[PDB]
Ligand binder design. Structure first.
Ligand SMILES: [Ca+2]
Ligand SMILES: [Ca+2]
Ligand SMILES: [Ca+2]
Lengths: 67, 105, 156
């Protein structure tokens, strides 16, 4: 029984557990659209992370050799 | 020099000419890699029973709160990399004719 | 950035080298050594709508003085002409990764040879030699990021 845990799970109840079946139709759609868009942002943020490890490693080689 | 500087320059230009093409080829590979990673991580929607249609909409709502946290954690790693990249780059940085031809001839 | 001007000098049409020789012979009208000293470069500059200083005048002579005789001869004059007739660093970095295939952070001789063969043009033993010792300006068999920038100066 956590205060911040009980309140967190209530976000579903306040947003979903109360209304239409025809609105739940066009509401569960936009909920997936949000995941897909956030899953796309996560892919690109992962790809940029790979390129930075190369960018950083090349810098570590340059800073050393130029000393 | 063993070869002409005109050939030396022609070869340098063809090296970048394909290195660019490998980069755009790399982007097309990354574009396909994304769509495949999205059909796996974001299996598209398809239908239901008005009662047990809801516990999926509840599950989607809980997914958004976790996806955006995973998106934040990788973002803050990219953010800290930007700080170090600009910091590392700061360290290393420390270490007429045609107007004449007409007015002559 | 130097051997990019000699290429332009080499590809000058003999109808362009004629106009330059003709304009060069007016340039040097009345010079003892038949070459552009500071008097000659002085007149044609102040009369070209300018007025450089005697010191500032020499740094245009010495910018293409591959002789050291304080006088721009015709051959140096062609380099002087092509100097007044590239690639951004941020873009050359993105391409530096394509060479570095093993992703170590340097461009060894093998990665250079693979790119050269991928150009479709016929590579020789002397093309590979001269290119590597041109880019590798300390003879360590590899081209680090700082040299690769000097290697691709002004390349289209
Ligand atoms: Ca001279
Ligand atoms: Ca390498
Ligand atoms: Ca080197």
């Amino acid at each position: 029984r956590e205060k911040k845990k009980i309140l967190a799970e209530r976000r579903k109840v306040l947003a979903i557990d109360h209304l239409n079946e025809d609105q739940l139709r066009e509401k569960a759609k936009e909920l997936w659209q949000s995941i897909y868009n956030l899953e796309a942002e996560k892919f690109d943020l992962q790809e940029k992370f790979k390129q930075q490890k190369y960018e950083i490693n090349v810098l570590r080689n340059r800073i050393n050799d130029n000393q | 020099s063993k070869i002409s500087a005109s050939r030396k320059l022609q070869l340098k230009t063809l090296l970048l000419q394909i290195a660019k093409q490998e980069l755009e080829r790399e982007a097309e590979e990354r574009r396909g890699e994304k769509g495949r990673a999205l059909s796996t991580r974001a299996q598209p929607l398809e239908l239901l029973g008005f009662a047990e249609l809801q516990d999926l909409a509840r599950q989607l709502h809980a997914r958004v709160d976790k996806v955006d946290e995973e998106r934040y954690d990788i973002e803050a790693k990219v953010t800290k990399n930007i700080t170090e990249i600009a910091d590392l780059t700061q360290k290393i940085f420390d270490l007429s004719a045609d107007a004449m031809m007409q007015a002559l001839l | 950035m130097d051997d990019i001007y000699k290429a332009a000098v080499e590809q000058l049409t003999e109808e362009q080298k004629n106009e330059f020789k003709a304009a060069f012979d007016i340039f040097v009208l009345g010079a003892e050594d038949g070459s552009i000293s500071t008097k000659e470069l002085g007149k044609v500059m102040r009369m070209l709508g300018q007025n450089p200083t005697p010191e500032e005048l020499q740094e245009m002579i010495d910018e293409v003085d591959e002789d050291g005789s304080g006088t721009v001869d015709f051959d140096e004059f062609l380099v002087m002409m092509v100097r007044s007739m590239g690639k951004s660093e941020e873009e050359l970095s993105d391409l530096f990764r394509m060479f570095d295939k093993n992703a170590d952070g340097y461009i060894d001789l093998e990665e250079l040879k693979i790119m050269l063969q991928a150009t479709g043009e016929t590579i020789t033993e002397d093309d590979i030699e001269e290119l590597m010792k041109d880019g590798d300006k300390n003879n360590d068999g590899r081209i680090d990021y700082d040299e690769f920038l000097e290697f691709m100066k002004g390349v289209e």
